[PDB]
Write a protein that binds this ligand. Structure first.
Ligand code: ZN
Ligand code: ZN
Ligand code: ZN
Ligand code: ZN
Lengths: 114, 20
């Protein structure tokens, strides 16, 4: 049943907890991982499960879909998106101190109600 | 703000090299 790319358990067993959890298979390379291990959340988990998810490196800056200066390519926290700090609507200069949120996150933030 | 660089990218792990 595959294994996650961080503890290498499976879609029904974590190696770091010993708890059942469905892995996420990258759509760019095909490697599996526990969203929890992926540092994700449930929204991210679901997101990857509903669309073409990428495992960090496979994660290209959707904004310009290049992933050039990836060393800036921020990491989303609700879906699994990736945006170059210098591509964002309000381009980042330095990795936000708190929990950064991609645009999908924001549009989802509003879409939550109304 | 997990950025895609050395200092971070802890979600870029893909099974440790142990299976030869
Ligand atoms: Zn795991
Ligand atoms: Zn991948
Ligand atoms: Zn970009
Ligand atoms: Zn997001």
């Amino acid at each position: 049943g595959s294994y996650c790319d961080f503890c290498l358990g499976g879609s029904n067993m974590n190696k770091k907890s010993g708890r059942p959890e469905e892995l996420v298979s990258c759509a760019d390379c095909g490697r599996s991982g526990h969203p929890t291990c992926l540092q994700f959340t449930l929204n991210m988990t679901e997101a990857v499960k509903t669309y073409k998810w990428q495992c960090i490196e496979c994660k290209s800056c959707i904004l310009c879909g290049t992933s050039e200066n990836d060393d800036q390519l921020l990491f989303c926290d609700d879906c699994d998106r990736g945006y170059h700090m210098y591509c964002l609507n309000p381009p980042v200069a330095e990795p936000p101190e708190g929990s950064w949120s991609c645009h999908l996150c924001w549009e989802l933030l509003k879409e939550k109600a109304s | 703000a997990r950025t895609k660089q050395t200092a971070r990218k802890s979600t870029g792990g893909k099974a440790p090299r142990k299976q030869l």
